[PDB]
Design a protein around this nucleic acid. Sequence first.
RNA 1: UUAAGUGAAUAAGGGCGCACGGUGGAUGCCUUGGCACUAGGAGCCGAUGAAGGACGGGACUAACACCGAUAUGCUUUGGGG
RNA 2: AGUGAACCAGUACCGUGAGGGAAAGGUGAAAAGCACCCCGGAAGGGGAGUGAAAUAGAUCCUGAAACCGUGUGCCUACAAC
RNA 3: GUAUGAGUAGCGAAAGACAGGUGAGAAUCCUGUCCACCGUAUGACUAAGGUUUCCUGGGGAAGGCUCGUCCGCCCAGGGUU
Lengths: 112, 44, 56, 124
Amino acid sequence: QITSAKATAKTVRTSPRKARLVIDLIRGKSVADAISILKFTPNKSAGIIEKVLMSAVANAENNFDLDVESLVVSEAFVNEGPTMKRFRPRAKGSASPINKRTSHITVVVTEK
Amino acid sequence: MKRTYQPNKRKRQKVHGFRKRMSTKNGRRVLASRRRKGRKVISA
Amino acid sequence: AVPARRTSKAKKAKRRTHYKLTIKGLNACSNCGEMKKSHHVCPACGHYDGKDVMSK
Amino acid sequence: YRKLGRTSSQRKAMLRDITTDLIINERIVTTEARAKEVRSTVEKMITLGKRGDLHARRQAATFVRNEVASVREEDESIVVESALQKLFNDLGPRFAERQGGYTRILKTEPRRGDAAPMVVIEFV
RNA sequence: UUAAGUGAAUAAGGGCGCACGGUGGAUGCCUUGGCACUAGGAGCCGAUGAAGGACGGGACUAACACCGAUAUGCUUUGGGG
RNA sequence: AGUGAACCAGUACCGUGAGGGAAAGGUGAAAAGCACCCCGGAAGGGGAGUGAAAUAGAUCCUGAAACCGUGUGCCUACAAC
RNA sequence: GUAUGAGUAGCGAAAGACAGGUGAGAAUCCUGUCCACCGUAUGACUAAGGUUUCCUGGGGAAGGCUCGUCCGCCCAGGGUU
Ligand SMILES: [Zn+2]
Protein backbone atom coordinates (compact mmCIF):
# COMPACT_ATOMS: atom_id res chain seq x y z
CA GLN A 1 0.00 0.00 0.00
CA ILE A 2 1.23 3.44 -1.01
CA THR A 3 1.49 5.97 1.84
CA SER A 4 2.00 9.37 0.21
CA ALA A 5 0.14 11.93 -1.90
CA LYS A 6 1.08 15.01 -3.90
CA ALA A 7 -0.62 18.02 -5.44
CA THR A 8 0.72 20.78 -7.65
CA ALA A 9 -0.23 24.18 -9.04
CA LYS A 10 1.11 25.22 -12.43
CA THR A 11 1.80 28.69 -13.83
CA VAL A 12 0.60 30.62 -10.83
CA ARG A 13 1.22 34.34 -11.23
CA THR A 14 3.68 34.96 -8.41
CA SER A 15 7.47 35.18 -8.46
CA PRO A 16 9.44 32.04 -7.55
CA ARG A 17 11.84 33.83 -5.21
CA LYS A 18 9.21 35.16 -2.83
CA ALA A 19 7.22 31.91 -2.75
CA ARG A 20 10.37 30.19 -1.50
CA LEU A 21 10.56 32.35 1.65
CA VAL A 22 7.17 31.03 2.75
CA ILE A 23 7.71 27.37 1.82
CA ASP A 24 10.90 27.03 3.87
CA LEU A 25 8.75 27.82 6.96
CA ILE A 26 6.66 24.71 6.39
CA ARG A 27 8.98 21.90 5.33
CA GLY A 28 9.28 18.98 7.73
CA LYS A 29 6.26 20.03 9.80
CA SER A 30 3.16 18.12 10.72
CA VAL A 31 0.13 18.98 8.61
CA ALA A 32 -1.47 20.31 11.80
CA ASP A 33 1.26 22.94 12.29
CA ALA A 34 1.63 24.00 8.67
CA ILE A 35 -1.94 25.26 8.35
CA SER A 36 -1.77 27.60 11.33
CA ILE A 37 1.66 28.81 10.25
CA LEU A 38 0.22 29.66 6.83
CA LYS A 39 -2.83 31.39 8.29
CA PHE A 40 -0.73 33.96 10.18
CA THR A 41 1.75 34.97 7.48
CA PRO A 42 0.53 37.98 5.48
CA ASN A 43 2.57 37.36 2.32
CA LYS A 44 0.70 37.04 -0.95
CA SER A 45 1.92 33.51 -1.63
CA ALA A 46 1.06 32.20 1.83
CA GLY A 47 -2.57 31.55 0.90
CA ILE A 48 -1.76 29.82 -2.41
CA ILE A 49 0.49 27.27 -0.75
CA GLU A 50 -2.43 26.79 1.66
CA LYS A 51 -4.65 25.57 -1.18
CA VAL A 52 -1.97 23.26 -2.57
CA LEU A 53 -1.40 21.77 0.90
CA MET A 54 -5.14 21.24 1.40
CA SER A 55 -5.41 19.44 -1.95
CA ALA A 56 -2.59 17.11 -0.90
CA VAL A 57 -4.56 16.31 2.26
CA ALA A 58 -7.88 15.70 0.47
CA ASN A 59 -6.09 13.39 -1.98
CA ALA A 60 -4.61 11.41 0.91
CA GLU A 61 -8.00 11.02 2.58
CA ASN A 62 -10.15 10.17 -0.42
CA ASN A 63 -8.01 8.42 -3.02
CA PHE A 64 -5.69 6.31 -0.85
CA ASP A 65 -4.91 6.95 2.75
CA LEU A 66 -6.47 7.57 6.09
CA ASP A 67 -5.13 9.13 9.26
CA VAL A 68 -5.02 12.88 8.85
CA GLU A 69 -3.43 12.97 12.32
CA SER A 70 -0.31 11.05 11.32
CA LEU A 71 0.53 13.01 8.15
CA VAL A 72 3.72 15.07 7.79
CA VAL A 73 4.96 17.50 5.12
CA SER A 74 7.85 15.51 3.64
CA GLU A 75 8.72 17.30 0.36
CA ALA A 76 8.17 20.83 -0.94
CA PHE A 77 9.60 23.03 -3.67
CA VAL A 78 8.89 25.85 -6.10
CA ASN A 79 10.03 25.80 -9.73
CA GLU A 80 9.83 28.42 -12.48
CA GLY A 81 7.17 28.77 -15.11
CA PRO A 82 7.20 30.53 -18.46
CA THR A 83 7.56 34.32 -18.30
CA MET A 84 5.62 37.03 -20.10
CA LYS A 85 7.58 39.84 -21.74
CA ARG A 86 6.58 43.51 -21.61
CA PHE A 87 8.15 46.92 -22.21
CA ARG A 88 7.86 50.11 -20.22
CA PRO A 89 8.52 53.49 -21.84
CA ARG A 90 11.48 55.36 -20.40
CA ALA A 91 12.72 58.93 -20.65
CA LYS A 92 14.03 60.39 -23.91
CA GLY A 93 12.32 57.99 -26.32
CA SER A 94 13.84 54.65 -25.26
CA ALA A 95 12.20 51.70 -23.48
CA SER A 96 13.21 48.87 -21.17
CA PRO A 97 11.86 45.35 -20.69
CA ILE A 98 9.86 43.91 -17.80
CA ASN A 99 9.47 40.24 -16.82
CA LYS A 100 6.17 38.88 -15.54
CA ARG A 101 7.18 35.66 -13.81
CA THR A 102 5.29 32.47 -12.83
CA SER A 103 5.69 29.48 -10.47
CA HIS A 104 4.89 25.77 -10.31
CA ILE A 105 4.23 24.76 -6.68
CA THR A 106 4.16 21.14 -5.43
CA VAL A 107 3.62 19.68 -1.94
CA VAL A 108 3.83 16.06 -0.78
CA VAL A 109 2.44 14.47 2.39
CA THR A 110 3.34 11.09 3.89
CA GLU A 111 1.60 9.05 6.56
CA LYS A 112 4.86 9.41 8.44
CA MET B 1 5.60 72.17 -27.87
CA LYS B 2 3.91 71.68 -31.24
CA ARG B 3 4.90 68.50 -33.10
CA THR B 4 5.16 67.97 -36.87
CA TYR B 5 2.11 65.80 -37.66
CA GLN B 6 -1.16 67.72 -37.45
CA PRO B 7 -3.91 65.67 -39.12
CA ASN B 8 -6.29 67.02 -41.76
CA LYS B 9 -8.66 65.15 -44.08
CA ARG B 10 -8.69 67.40 -47.15
CA LYS B 11 -4.92 67.86 -47.35
CA ARG B 12 -4.18 64.15 -47.19
CA GLN B 13 -6.47 63.51 -50.16
CA LYS B 14 -5.24 66.51 -52.13
CA VAL B 15 -1.51 65.83 -51.82
CA HIS B 16 -1.42 62.02 -51.71
CA GLY B 17 -4.67 60.74 -53.23
CA PHE B 18 -5.59 58.75 -56.30
CA ARG B 19 -6.41 61.64 -58.63
CA LYS B 20 -3.24 63.58 -57.77
CA ARG B 21 -1.21 60.46 -58.56
CA MET B 22 -3.12 60.03 -61.82
CA SER B 23 -2.57 63.57 -63.09
CA THR B 24 1.24 63.42 -63.46
CA LYS B 25 3.44 61.11 -65.49
CA ASN B 26 5.58 60.28 -62.43
CA GLY B 27 2.55 59.59 -60.25
CA ARG B 28 1.73 56.71 -62.57
CA ARG B 29 5.26 55.40 -62.19
CA VAL B 30 4.52 55.31 -58.45
CA LEU B 31 1.18 53.54 -58.93
CA ALA B 32 2.72 50.94 -61.25
CA SER B 33 5.61 50.29 -58.87
CA ARG B 34 3.12 49.73 -56.07
CA ARG B 35 0.92 47.39 -58.14
CA ARG B 36 4.05 45.43 -59.05
CA LYS B 37 4.92 44.77 -55.40
CA GLY B 38 1.52 43.56 -54.23
CA ARG B 39 0.44 46.40 -51.98
CA LYS B 40 -3.12 46.23 -50.65
CA VAL B 41 -3.18 50.04 -50.57
CA ILE B 42 -1.58 51.69 -53.57
CA SER B 43 -2.58 55.28 -52.86
CA ALA B 44 -3.64 57.21 -49.80
CA ALA C 1 28.98 53.73 -10.32
CA VAL C 2 28.58 50.44 -12.14
CA PRO C 3 29.47 46.85 -11.17
CA ALA C 4 32.96 46.11 -12.44
CA ARG C 5 32.51 42.32 -12.25
CA ARG C 6 29.45 40.11 -12.15
CA THR C 7 28.80 38.32 -8.86
CA SER C 8 28.99 34.55 -8.71
CA LYS C 9 26.54 32.01 -7.28
CA ALA C 10 28.36 31.51 -3.98
CA LYS C 11 28.61 35.24 -3.16
CA LYS C 12 24.98 35.90 -4.08
CA ALA C 13 23.88 33.10 -1.76
CA LYS C 14 26.21 34.31 0.99
CA ARG C 15 24.56 37.69 0.77
CA ARG C 16 21.14 36.06 0.98
CA THR C 17 21.58 34.29 4.32
CA HIS C 18 19.90 37.04 6.38
CA TYR C 19 16.92 37.32 4.00
CA LYS C 20 14.31 35.03 5.53
CA LEU C 21 10.94 35.01 7.27
CA THR C 22 9.92 34.40 10.85
CA ILE C 23 6.74 33.11 12.47
CA LYS C 24 6.71 34.56 15.99
CA GLY C 25 4.62 33.91 19.06
CA LEU C 26 1.77 31.50 18.35
CA ASN C 27 -0.21 29.96 21.21
CA ALA C 28 -3.33 27.89 21.70
CA CYS C 29 -6.62 29.53 22.56
CA SER C 30 -7.92 28.99 26.07
CA ASN C 31 -11.55 28.69 24.89
CA CYS C 32 -11.45 26.66 21.65
CA GLY C 33 -7.95 25.19 21.47
CA GLU C 34 -6.90 26.34 18.00
CA MET C 35 -3.72 28.32 17.47
CA LYS C 36 -3.76 32.08 17.63
CA LYS C 37 -1.49 35.08 18.05
CA SER C 38 -0.88 36.07 21.65
CA HIS C 39 -2.40 39.38 22.88
CA HIS C 40 -4.80 39.21 19.90
CA VAL C 41 -8.42 38.16 19.56
CA CYS C 42 -8.89 34.58 18.45
CA PRO C 43 -10.06 34.64 14.82
CA ALA C 44 -11.70 31.20 14.97
CA CYS C 45 -14.15 31.96 17.79
CA GLY C 46 -13.92 35.66 18.66
CA HIS C 47 -12.93 35.08 22.29
CA TYR C 48 -10.23 37.08 24.05
CA ASP C 49 -9.41 36.55 27.72
CA GLY C 50 -12.22 34.08 28.40
CA LYS C 51 -15.05 36.26 27.09
CA ASP C 52 -16.90 36.80 23.82
CA VAL C 53 -15.99 39.98 21.95
CA MET C 54 -16.97 39.76 18.26
CA SER C 55 -20.63 39.32 19.12
CA LYS C 56 -23.53 41.38 20.44
CA TYR D 1 2.24 63.16 19.93
CA ARG D 2 2.24 61.27 16.63
CA LYS D 3 2.14 63.05 13.39
CA LEU D 4 0.03 60.60 11.42
CA GLY D 5 1.33 61.10 7.88
CA ARG D 6 -0.56 64.39 7.53
CA THR D 7 0.02 68.12 7.81
CA SER D 8 -1.19 70.05 10.84
CA SER D 9 -4.73 70.84 9.68
CA GLN D 10 -5.41 67.44 8.09
CA ARG D 11 -4.45 65.63 11.29
CA LYS D 12 -6.96 67.82 13.13
CA ALA D 13 -9.69 67.15 10.55
CA MET D 14 -9.08 63.40 10.71
CA LEU D 15 -9.20 63.25 14.51
CA ARG D 16 -12.32 65.42 14.65
CA ASP D 17 -13.99 62.93 12.31
CA ILE D 18 -12.90 59.70 13.98
CA THR D 19 -14.02 60.88 17.42
CA THR D 20 -17.47 61.95 16.20
CA ASP D 21 -17.75 58.48 14.88
CA LEU D 22 -17.58 56.32 18.04
CA ILE D 23 -19.73 58.90 19.72
CA ILE D 24 -22.38 58.02 17.19
CA ASN D 25 -21.48 54.33 16.79
CA GLU D 26 -19.69 53.33 20.06
CA ARG D 27 -17.52 50.73 18.29
CA ILE D 28 -15.18 51.16 15.31
CA VAL D 29 -12.43 49.44 13.30
CA THR D 30 -9.25 51.44 12.63
CA THR D 31 -5.48 51.11 12.48
CA GLU D 32 -3.36 51.01 15.62
CA ALA D 33 -1.74 54.47 15.67
CA ARG D 34 -5.01 56.31 15.05
CA ALA D 35 -6.73 54.34 17.80
CA LYS D 36 -4.25 55.46 20.45
CA GLU D 37 -4.40 59.12 19.51
CA VAL D 38 -8.18 58.83 19.48
CA ARG D 39 -8.50 57.23 22.92
CA SER D 40 -6.88 60.40 24.23
CA THR D 41 -9.18 62.80 22.33
CA VAL D 42 -12.45 61.00 23.08
CA GLU D 43 -11.92 60.78 26.80
CA LYS D 44 -11.13 64.50 26.83
CA MET D 45 -14.60 64.99 25.30
CA ILE D 46 -16.30 62.80 27.90
CA THR D 47 -14.90 64.71 30.83
CA LEU D 48 -16.50 67.84 29.40
CA GLY D 49 -19.78 66.01 28.92
CA LYS D 50 -19.64 65.15 32.63
CA ARG D 51 -18.92 68.76 33.66
CA GLY D 52 -22.30 69.81 32.32
CA ASP D 53 -22.43 73.63 32.13
CA LEU D 54 -22.72 76.08 29.23
CA HIS D 55 -19.00 76.89 29.13
CA ALA D 56 -18.19 73.17 28.79
CA ARG D 57 -20.78 72.79 26.01
CA ARG D 58 -19.26 75.59 23.95
CA GLN D 59 -15.81 74.16 24.61
CA ALA D 60 -16.86 70.80 23.20
CA ALA D 61 -18.62 72.40 20.23
CA THR D 62 -15.24 73.47 18.88
CA PHE D 63 -14.34 69.81 18.39
CA VAL D 64 -17.44 67.68 17.82
CA ARG D 65 -18.79 67.61 14.28
CA ASN D 66 -22.07 69.35 13.69
CA GLU D 67 -24.29 68.31 10.84
CA VAL D 68 -24.27 64.69 11.99
CA ALA D 69 -27.22 62.92 13.58
CA SER D 70 -27.39 60.03 16.01
CA VAL D 71 -31.00 58.86 16.27
CA ARG D 72 -32.59 55.87 17.91
CA GLU D 73 -35.61 57.87 19.12
CA GLU D 74 -39.25 58.53 18.20
CA ASP D 75 -42.18 59.14 20.56
CA GLU D 76 -44.34 60.53 17.80
CA SER D 77 -42.38 62.93 15.59
CA ILE D 78 -39.20 63.17 13.62
CA VAL D 79 -37.14 64.18 16.69
CA VAL D 80 -33.40 64.16 16.01
CA GLU D 81 -30.52 64.02 18.48
CA SER D 82 -27.38 65.85 17.44
CA ALA D 83 -24.27 63.87 18.58
CA LEU D 84 -23.38 66.75 20.89
CA GLN D 85 -26.78 66.39 22.49
CA LYS D 86 -25.97 62.71 22.90
CA LEU D 87 -22.65 63.57 24.54
CA PHE D 88 -24.43 65.71 27.08
CA ASN D 89 -27.64 63.74 27.70
CA ASP D 90 -26.42 60.13 27.42
CA LEU D 91 -22.68 59.47 27.64
CA GLY D 92 -21.82 61.77 30.54
CA PRO D 93 -24.54 60.41 32.83
CA ARG D 94 -23.45 56.89 31.87
CA PHE D 95 -19.91 57.38 33.16
CA ALA D 96 -20.98 59.54 36.12
CA GLU D 97 -19.28 57.39 38.76
CA ARG D 98 -16.35 56.02 36.78
CA GLN D 99 -13.04 57.89 36.91
CA GLY D 100 -10.94 57.97 33.76
CA GLY D 101 -10.64 55.09 31.31
CA TYR D 102 -13.88 55.06 29.32
CA THR D 103 -12.58 53.04 26.34
CA ARG D 104 -10.57 49.90 25.53
CA ILE D 105 -8.68 48.56 22.52
CA LEU D 106 -8.50 45.02 21.10
CA LYS D 107 -6.22 43.77 18.34
CA THR D 108 -7.47 41.69 15.43
CA GLU D 109 -5.68 41.39 12.12
CA PRO D 110 -3.75 42.96 9.24
CA ARG D 111 -5.66 44.47 6.34
CA ARG D 112 -5.39 42.61 3.04
CA GLY D 113 -4.22 45.38 0.74
CA ASP D 114 -1.79 46.85 3.24
CA ALA D 115 -0.72 44.56 6.06
CA ALA D 116 -1.82 47.47 8.27
CA PRO D 117 -2.52 46.15 11.80
CA MET D 118 -6.17 46.74 12.67
CA VAL D 119 -7.92 47.28 15.96
CA VAL D 120 -11.37 47.71 17.56
CA ILE D 121 -11.91 50.57 20.01
CA GLU D 122 -15.13 50.53 22.06
CA PHE D 123 -16.52 52.24 25.14
CA VAL D 124 -17.38 50.42 28.30
C1' U E 1 41.50 16.99 44.92
C1' U E 2 45.35 20.65 43.15
C1' A E 3 48.99 21.93 39.37
C1' A E 4 51.36 21.52 34.46
C1' G E 5 50.20 19.56 29.44
C1' U E 6 47.62 17.65 25.02
C1' G E 7 42.62 18.27 22.98
C1' A E 8 37.68 15.72 19.41
C1' A E 9 32.75 16.47 18.20
C1' U E 10 28.68 20.21 17.13
C1' A E 11 27.48 24.63 10.35
C1' A E 12 24.22 30.61 10.52
C1' G E 13 25.77 29.75 5.64
C1' G E 14 29.39 27.87 1.61
C1' G E 15 32.35 24.05 -1.77
C1' C E 16 33.16 19.27 -4.60
C1' G E 17 30.91 14.59 -6.41
C1' C E 18 26.28 12.05 -7.37
C1' A E 19 20.54 11.46 -8.08
C1' C E 20 15.95 13.62 -9.54
C1' G E 21 13.19 17.77 -11.42
C1' G E 22 11.97 22.78 -13.89
C1' U E 23 12.85 26.32 -17.75
C1' G E 24 14.67 26.53 -23.08
C1' G E 25 14.36 24.84 -27.87
C1' A E 26 19.80 22.80 -29.96
C1' U E 27 20.27 17.79 -32.34
C1' G E 28 18.23 13.44 -35.22
C1' C E 29 14.44 11.90 -38.53
C1' C E 30 10.45 14.06 -41.88
C1' U E 31 7.68 17.42 -45.83
C1' U E 32 3.19 20.33 -47.33
C1' G E 33 7.23 24.98 -50.02
C1' G E 34 11.38 26.42 -52.81
C1' C E 35 16.07 26.58 -56.55
C1' A E 36 18.56 25.42 -61.36
C1' C E 37 17.27 23.35 -65.94
C1' U E 38 15.21 20.01 -70.28
C1' A E 39 11.34 18.83 -74.06
C1' G E 40 6.60 20.73 -76.03
C1' G E 41 2.59 24.85 -76.45
C1' A E 42 1.80 29.92 -76.44
C1' G E 43 4.12 34.93 -77.06
C1' C E 44 -0.35 39.85 -76.20
C1' C E 45 -5.18 42.22 -73.70
C1' G E 46 -8.10 46.94 -74.62
C1' A E 47 -14.02 52.25 -76.71
C1' U E 48 -18.17 45.36 -78.50
C1' G E 49 -14.92 49.14 -72.22
C1' A E 50 -8.71 46.32 -70.33
C1' A E 51 -4.79 45.40 -66.24
C1' G E 52 -6.04 46.14 -61.21
C1' G E 53 -9.62 47.03 -57.65
C1' A E 54 -14.40 48.63 -54.44
C1' C E 55 -18.87 46.79 -52.79
C1' G E 56 -22.10 42.72 -52.62
C1' G E 57 -24.33 37.13 -53.18
C1' G E 58 -24.93 31.60 -48.12
C1' A E 59 -30.29 28.99 -43.09
C1' C E 60 -26.52 30.91 -39.17
C1' U E 61 -21.22 34.36 -42.33
C1' A E 62 -15.91 37.99 -39.05
C1' A E 63 -12.19 35.74 -42.82
C1' C E 64 -10.32 33.13 -47.26
C1' A E 65 -11.68 30.74 -52.01
C1' C E 66 -15.91 31.03 -55.97
C1' C E 67 -19.52 33.97 -58.31
C1' G E 68 -22.24 39.29 -60.13
C1' A E 69 -29.22 41.62 -58.77
C1' U E 70 -29.99 35.15 -63.33
C1' A E 71 -24.82 36.53 -57.60
C1' U E 72 -21.88 29.50 -53.08
C1' G E 73 -24.66 30.01 -59.64
C1' C E 74 -28.26 29.42 -65.38
C1' U E 75 -28.46 26.47 -70.52
C1' U E 76 -26.18 23.03 -74.00
C1' U E 77 -23.04 18.94 -75.91
C1' G E 78 -19.88 14.86 -74.31
C1' G E 79 -17.48 11.79 -70.11
C1' G E 80 -18.43 9.12 -65.30
C1' G E 81 -21.82 5.89 -62.02
C1' A F 1 18.43 26.37 -45.00
C1' G F 2 15.46 26.93 -49.54
C1' U F 3 11.82 32.48 -52.45
C1' G F 4 11.01 38.21 -48.43
C1' A F 5 6.96 34.63 -47.76
C1' A F 6 6.18 25.76 -46.53
C1' C F 7 1.56 28.78 -41.86
C1' C F 8 -4.56 33.84 -44.62
C1' A F 9 3.03 37.74 -46.58
C1' G F 10 4.20 42.18 -49.49
C1' U F 11 0.58 40.66 -44.26
C1' A F 12 1.25 42.74 -38.86
C1' C F 13 4.41 46.65 -37.88
C1' C F 14 7.28 51.52 -39.02
C1' G F 15 6.96 56.50 -42.06
C1' U F 16 3.33 62.88 -44.07
C1' G F 17 5.09 60.45 -48.23
C1' A F 18 8.03 58.01 -51.84
C1' G F 19 9.45 53.72 -49.33
C1' G F 20 11.24 49.95 -45.55
C1' G F 21 9.29 44.95 -43.62
C1' A F 22 9.19 40.49 -40.11
C1' A F 23 8.14 36.28 -36.56
C1' A F 24 5.56 31.85 -36.70
C1' G F 25 6.09 23.58 -39.60
C1' G F 26 5.65 18.08 -36.46
C1' U F 27 -0.21 14.53 -30.59
C1' G F 28 -1.57 9.54 -32.34
C1' A F 29 -2.27 4.07 -36.73
C1' A F 30 -7.01 5.84 -35.54
C1' A F 31 -9.72 11.63 -31.61
C1' A F 32 -10.32 6.54 -29.48
C1' G F 33 -9.07 14.50 -27.29
C1' C F 34 -9.89 11.95 -20.42
C1' A F 35 -17.58 9.71 -19.04
C1' C F 36 -17.68 9.52 -13.40
C1' C F 37 -15.62 11.02 -8.43
C1' C F 38 -12.66 14.14 -4.96
C1' C F 39 -9.90 19.37 -3.31
C1' G F 40 -10.73 24.17 -5.21
C1' G F 41 -14.57 30.77 -7.14
C1' A F 42 -11.67 29.36 -11.16
C1' A F 43 -6.96 27.89 -12.97
C1' G F 44 -4.54 23.52 -11.75
C1' G F 45 -4.16 18.78 -9.65
C1' G F 46 -5.13 13.46 -7.71
C1' G F 47 -7.87 8.84 -8.85
C1' A F 48 -10.72 6.09 -12.61
C1' G F 49 -10.72 5.29 -17.59
C1' U F 50 -8.65 5.49 -23.71
C1' G F 51 -4.38 3.84 -25.81
C1' A F 52 1.25 -0.55 -27.72
C1' A F 53 3.08 4.05 -24.89
C1' A F 54 0.10 9.89 -21.54
C1' U F 55 6.88 11.60 -18.20
C1' A F 56 2.36 10.89 -26.40
C1' G F 57 -2.87 15.51 -22.98
C1' A F 58 -2.94 19.96 -27.19
C1' U F 59 2.85 25.39 -24.43
C1' C F 60 1.48 17.97 -27.14
C1' C F 61 7.90 13.65 -31.75
C1' U F 62 13.02 13.73 -29.93
C1' G F 63 14.11 17.13 -25.71
C1' A F 64 21.29 19.40 -25.58
C1' A F 65 23.55 23.73 -22.91
C1' A F 66 23.26 28.34 -20.16
C1' C F 67 20.13 29.38 -15.84
C1' C F 68 16.80 28.04 -11.25
C1' G F 69 15.68 24.33 -7.38
C1' U F 70 15.17 19.81 -3.80
C1' G F 71 17.91 15.47 -1.31
C1' U F 72 22.52 13.52 0.21
C1' G F 73 28.76 10.81 0.81
C1' C F 74 33.10 13.90 2.06
C1' C F 75 35.31 19.17 3.61
C1' U F 76 34.87 24.04 5.90
C1' A F 77 34.25 29.88 11.20
C1' C F 78 43.30 32.14 13.04
C1' A F 79 42.50 32.73 7.43
C1' A F 80 45.62 36.66 1.98
C1' C F 81 43.70 31.98 -2.55
C1' G G 1 17.45 32.01 -24.93
C1' U G 2 18.96 33.07 -20.03
C1' A G 3 21.91 35.48 -15.93
C1' U G 4 24.46 39.69 -12.82
C1' G G 5 23.35 44.55 -10.77
C1' A G 6 18.48 42.98 -6.89
C1' G G 7 13.93 41.86 -4.43
C1' U G 8 17.48 47.16 -5.48
C1' A G 9 15.81 52.55 -8.27
C1' G G 10 10.96 53.93 -9.50
C1' C G 11 5.34 53.30 -8.94
C1' G G 12 4.26 60.43 -13.14
C1' A G 13 2.00 67.59 -8.81
C1' A G 14 -3.22 67.28 -4.95
C1' A G 15 -7.75 65.16 1.44
C1' G G 16 -10.10 61.91 3.32
C1' A G 17 -12.84 59.21 7.38
C1' C G 18 -16.36 55.88 9.20
C1' A G 19 -21.16 52.93 8.82
C1' G G 20 -23.62 49.66 6.01
C1' G G 21 -24.09 46.51 1.12
C1' U G 22 -22.22 42.89 -2.52
C1' G G 23 -19.04 38.96 -2.79
C1' A G 24 -14.81 32.99 -2.73
C1' G G 25 -12.04 37.21 -1.51
C1' A G 26 -12.63 44.56 -0.46
C1' A G 27 -7.85 50.83 1.69
C1' U G 28 -9.19 50.65 -4.01
C1' C G 29 -16.65 48.55 -6.47
C1' C G 30 -21.90 50.40 -4.57
C1' U G 31 -25.13 53.53 -1.09
C1' G G 32 -24.98 57.21 2.86
C1' U G 33 -23.17 61.08 6.07
C1' C G 34 -19.73 64.84 7.28
C1' C G 35 -15.02 66.89 5.67
C1' A G 36 -11.65 69.04 1.64
C1' C G 37 -10.34 71.10 -3.78
C1' C G 38 -11.51 74.38 -8.82
C1' G G 39 -15.05 78.29 -10.04
C1' U G 40 -12.52 84.03 -16.94
C1' A G 41 -12.43 77.43 -14.88
C1' U G 42 -11.04 71.79 -13.15
C1' G G 43 -18.29 74.65 -15.10
C1' A G 44 -21.75 74.85 -20.16
C1' C G 45 -21.57 74.73 -25.83
C1' U G 46 -19.23 73.88 -30.16
C1' A G 47 -15.24 73.65 -35.35
C1' A G 48 -11.12 70.21 -36.38
C1' G G 49 -9.32 65.45 -35.29
C1' G G 50 -10.57 60.34 -33.66
C1' U G 51 -13.82 56.62 -35.56
C1' U G 52 -18.15 52.96 -32.09
C1' U G 53 -14.84 54.82 -27.59
C1' C G 54 -22.19 55.77 -26.80
C1' C G 55 -26.72 52.51 -24.00
C1' U G 56 -28.42 47.83 -21.61
C1' G G 57 -27.02 42.56 -19.62
C1' G G 58 -23.01 39.36 -18.43
C1' G G 59 -17.04 38.44 -17.49
C1' G G 60 -12.19 38.56 -14.98
C1' A G 61 -6.89 35.01 -18.79
C1' A G 62 -4.16 39.42 -20.61
C1' G G 63 -4.29 45.51 -20.58
C1' G G 64 -4.82 49.16 -15.80
C1' C G 65 2.61 51.09 -12.86
C1' U G 66 -0.72 48.06 -6.26
C1' C G 67 -5.71 45.91 -5.81
C1' G G 68 -10.17 44.83 -8.21
C1' U G 69 -16.42 41.98 -7.58
C1' C G 70 -14.53 47.54 -11.39
C1' C G 71 -13.31 49.96 -16.45
C1' G G 72 -12.45 54.08 -22.42
C1' C G 73 -10.68 46.29 -21.37
C1' C G 74 -13.33 41.23 -23.02
C1' C G 75 -18.25 38.56 -24.87
C1' A G 76 -23.82 39.25 -26.66
C1' G G 77 -27.63 42.45 -28.21
C1' G G 78 -28.96 47.44 -29.47
C1' G G 79 -28.78 52.77 -30.71
C1' U G 80 -27.80 58.34 -35.05
C1' U G 81 -35.11 59.93 -38.03
ZN1 LIG H 1 -10.51 30.40 20.19
